Design a protein around this motif. Structure first.
Motif, PDB file in Angstrom:
ATOM      1  N   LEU A   1      -8.488 -10.283   0.134  1.00 13.29           N
ATOM      2  CA  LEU A   1      -9.378  -9.240   0.944  1.00 13.29           C
ATOM      3  C   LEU A   1      -8.295  -8.104   1.325  1.00 13.29           C
ATOM      4  O   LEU A   1      -8.700  -7.126   1.367  1.00 13.29           O
ATOM      5  N   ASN A   2      -7.019  -8.524   1.458  1.00 12.70           N
ATOM      6  CA  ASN A   2      -5.871  -7.539   2.135  1.00 12.70           C
ATOM      7  C   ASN A   2      -5.705  -6.592   1.008  1.00 12.70           C
ATOM      8  O   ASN A   2      -5.346  -5.517   1.181  1.00 12.70           O
ATOM      9  N   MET A   3      -5.530  -7.009  -0.298  1.00 13.16           N
ATOM     10  CA  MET A   3      -5.205  -6.343  -1.648  1.00 13.16           C
ATOM     11  C   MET A   3      -6.272  -5.537  -2.137  1.00 13.16           C
ATOM     12  O   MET A   3      -6.131  -4.784  -3.062  1.00 13.16           O
ATOM     13  N   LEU A   4      -7.477  -6.033  -2.197  1.00  9.05           N
ATOM     14  CA  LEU A   4      -8.718  -5.700  -2.821  1.00  9.05           C
ATOM     15  C   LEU A   4      -8.875  -4.054  -2.769  1.00  9.05           C
ATOM     16  O   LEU A   4      -9.348  -3.712  -3.872  1.00  9.05           O
TER      17      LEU A   4
ATOM     18  N   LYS B   1       0.773  -1.247  -0.054  1.00 13.11           N
ATOM     19  CA  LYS B   1       0.037   0.056  -0.129  1.00 13.11           C
ATOM     20  C   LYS B   1       1.009   1.218  -0.085  1.00 13.11           C
ATOM     21  O   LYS B   1       0.506   2.166  -0.935  1.00 13.11           O
ATOM     22  N   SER B   2       2.040   1.328   0.783  1.00 14.15           N
ATOM     23  CA  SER B   2       2.831   2.540   0.977  1.00 14.15           C
ATOM     24  C   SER B   2       3.480   2.679  -0.453  1.00 14.15           C
ATOM     25  O   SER B   2       3.778   3.803  -0.877  1.00 14.15           O
ATOM     26  N   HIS B   3       4.059   1.250  -0.970  1.00 18.23           N
ATOM     27  CA  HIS B   3       4.865   1.549  -2.303  1.00 18.23           C
ATOM     28  C   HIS B   3       4.267   1.583  -3.369  1.00 18.23           C
ATOM     29  O   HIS B   3       4.829   2.696  -4.566  1.00 18.23           O
ATOM     30  N   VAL B   4       2.968   1.375  -3.789  1.00 21.66           N
ATOM     31  CA  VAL B   4       2.034   1.626  -4.962  1.00 21.66           C
ATOM     32  C   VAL B   4       1.554   2.886  -4.905  1.00 21.66           C
ATOM     33  O   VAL B   4       1.252   3.629  -5.776  1.00 21.66           O
ATOM     34  N   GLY B   5       1.411   3.542  -3.562  1.00 20.26           N
ATOM     35  CA  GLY B   5       0.685   4.681  -3.348  1.00 20.26           C
ATOM     36  C   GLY B   5      -0.821   4.941  -4.003  1.00 20.26           C
ATOM     37  O   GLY B   5      -1.522   3.857  -4.023  1.00 20.26           O
ATOM     38  N   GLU B   6      -0.781   5.984  -4.934  1.00 24.57           N
ATOM     39  CA  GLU B   6      -2.199   6.251  -5.496  1.00 24.57           C
ATOM     40  C   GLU B   6      -2.181   5.609  -6.823  1.00 24.57           C
ATOM     41  O   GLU B   6      -3.417   5.599  -7.329  1.00 24.57           O
ATOM     42  N   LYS B   7      -1.064   4.795  -7.364  1.00 25.08           N
ATOM     43  CA  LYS B   7      -1.486   4.076  -8.569  1.00 25.08           C
ATOM     44  C   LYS B   7      -2.421   3.054  -8.426  1.00 25.08           C
ATOM     45  O   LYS B   7      -3.004   2.444  -9.207  1.00 25.08           O
ATOM     46  N   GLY B   8      -2.443   2.343  -6.864  1.00 20.55           N
ATOM     47  CA  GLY B   8      -3.162   1.224  -6.480  1.00 20.55           C
ATOM     48  C   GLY B   8      -2.441  -0.056  -7.233  1.00 20.55           C
ATOM     49  O   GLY B   8      -0.799   0.135  -7.523  1.00 20.55           O
ATOM     50  N   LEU B   9      -3.015  -0.993  -6.993  1.00 22.89           N
ATOM     51  CA  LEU B   9      -2.313  -2.450  -7.479  1.00 22.89           C
ATOM     52  C   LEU B   9      -3.126  -2.938  -8.535  1.00 22.89           C
ATOM     53  O   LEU B   9      -4.286  -3.289  -8.579  1.00 22.89           O
ATOM     54  N   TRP B  10      -2.272  -2.784  -9.779  1.00 22.82           N
ATOM     55  CA  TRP B  10      -3.078  -3.138 -11.168  1.00 22.82           C
ATOM     56  C   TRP B  10      -3.671  -4.455 -10.942  1.00 22.82           C
ATOM     57  O   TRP B  10      -4.551  -4.831 -11.715  1.00 22.82           O
TER      58      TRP B  10
END
Ligand code: NAI
Ligand code: NAI
Lengths: 299, 298
Positions: free
Chosen positions: B125-128, B77-86
């Protein structure tokens, strides 16, 4: 049709006979002249079942999620049936668990329905299996349209899909011992399983501790708007539990028991057909009637 | 066509030490995605780092450890910031004990369900919230074992369950523009399914099995069943890229499919067989199974 003979000399073990299908099954097979062993969760469930049935029926207190209790009960059954073995196992015990959108839930929310519906069914099956082999008898697993077509978020659908998988592994492993394995897939039936008010009351407890982000995305009123919708389609719910017990009856007493039974006109003509459709078409038909989120772009 | 700005998109993959996950981490690193490769072991991640560009990061994740999953989700969550996780690729899995149902205890069912279902769910659930943020892709690795039951043990139940969870997630996520893809591989040469490892577990169980079961199956049953597993190790895909190609389409296509089938075995035999009634499946799947010595010894 050709039924089996010596029904009076055959034992049937049923899990979850306090209420619903299991209760009607215990009473129906007691009337038919089977020797029913009715596993109940509660003392009052078993007292009311004893009070309504003949001396041919015995009750035992079983929590299917308690492995000591299951092992003890299997020991009791093994003594009592002796060299007859156990003609019939009906794995009926089940719970709905928490039902809510996936993004409201924690992994722990998934545990209870899987622990009762899958692990409990498996453990009871593994503990009774030597007795069912001895009788060359019948294992009857109660699945769900929820085991062929996914419901909303929560462990119920995963648990029922898993039961479908275990049921097939068991059928193939048991063919060599002449043991038949039947899977029953009921539609929606008025039992104590699925209570719109109980279901909405759990969603509200989750809502109380839900992150600000999720609350903004769905919006205040989402739960109550989706109850107005659950209640629009509560008329199309079977009140005739005997459609399911009739299926159990054929699986217990037919010389040619089916590998799968579907109970409910809903299930035969809509739900199971829909389960064979590609996801593009299932999603189209199932999502038509779903409550719009207030702020889906609030991600 | 394909999506744009692959170079600006993060992909989180579970179980990258070996097999599909490892080839996927390497393939998406070459492609210019920013891979976060979750590995079970230090040596798995050291060998993966050593073979990949500086665009790739590795993290130590046991998917069955909920503290470890929550920490790793915080890190991501810190590392991707506002890009989110594609992209989330739930790849981590184990076979567990595979044996006839009447050899097993309920405990034998626990490990595969804990990794393949609970682990996949908890990571999902943690990455969603991060995948919603990116309007991205969840890719669940199932199995023909999730459409057609294998022998006894928790693998098939765990994979059937994944199929159920996958559909609940797809329907819950349509409103957030998040796509959910299920990959169903045939049989592939990885570290998952090792005829010798499988036979070695069956033998440990045999050592403590009741006299009754031993009489019913007979001495030699296990070794007769290995001579048979080894007769059909020719019909096992060595081309892991057939599965990673499917992950690639699910990550990069504007029109990702809800289900991909990898292997000519799967497309033309296994999945067709999964649509047939049980009379016909049992007919075809049992033809090649070792006869018990004394099945009436019950
Ligand atoms: N009613 C419906 O619409 C549907 C029901 N089913 C299945 O039918 C089965 C029977 O449920 P219903 O009669 O509908 O509901 P119910 O709640 O009236 O009956 C379920 C039974 O399970 C027992 N039980 C619950 N937890 C238990 C535990 N840990 N150990 C032992 N017993 C336990 C309860 O005492 C009860 O007798 C369940 O497996 C359910 O999933 C299938 C599809 C949908
Ligand atoms: N290989 C095949 O023929 C088939 C494989 N699959 C699925 O493919 C997926 C990948 O497995 P393969 O690459 O084939 O096998 P593999 O054993 O080579 O890879 C599995 C990966 O999971 C990781 N892993 C295992 N337990 C873990 C845990 N508790 N926490 C975190 N990571 C863990 C391992 O380190 C490894 O990197 C699995 O989900 C498997 O069920 C699907 C159908 C059949």
């Amino acid at each position: 049709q050709l039924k089996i003979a010596d029904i009076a000399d055959k034992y049937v073990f049923i899990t979850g006979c306090d209420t619903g299908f299991g209760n009607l099954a215990a009473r129906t097979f007691d009337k038919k002249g089977f020797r029913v062993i009715a596993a109940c969760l509660t003392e009052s469930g078993s007292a009311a079942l004893k009070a309504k049935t003949s001396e041919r029926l015995h009750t035992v207190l079983l929590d299917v999620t308690d492995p000591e209790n299951v092992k003890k009960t299997a020991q009791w059954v093994k003594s009592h049936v002796g060299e007859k073995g156990l003609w019939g196992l009906i794995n009926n015990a089940g719970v709905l668990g928490v039902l809510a959108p996936t993004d409201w839930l924690t992994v722990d929310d998934y545990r209870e329905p899987i622990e009762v519906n899958l692990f409990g069914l498996i453990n009871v099956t593994l503990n009774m299996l030597p007795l069912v082999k001895k009788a060359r008898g019948r294992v009857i697993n109660v699945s769900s349209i929820g085991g062929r077509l996914a419901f909303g978020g929560g462990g119920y659908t995963p648990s029922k899909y898993a039961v479908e998988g275990f049921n097939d592994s068991l059928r193939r492993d048991m063919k060599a011992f002449g043991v038949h394995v039947s899977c029953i897939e009921p539609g929606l039936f008025k039992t104590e399983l699925a209570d719109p008010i109980k279901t909405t009351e759990k969603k509200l407890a989750i809502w109380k501790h839900l992150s600000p982000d999720i609350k903004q995305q769905y919006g205040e009123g989402y739960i109550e708007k989706s109850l107005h919708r659950l209640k629009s389609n509560t008329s199309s719910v079977n009140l005739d539990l005997s459609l399911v017990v009739g299926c159990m009856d054929h699986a217990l007493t037919s010389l040619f028991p089916k590998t799968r039974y579907i109970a409910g006109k809903d299930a035969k003509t809509f739900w199971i057909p829909l389960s064979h459709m590609p996801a593009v078409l299932q999603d189209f038909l199932l999502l038509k009637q779903k409550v719009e989120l207030a702020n889906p772009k609030a991600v």
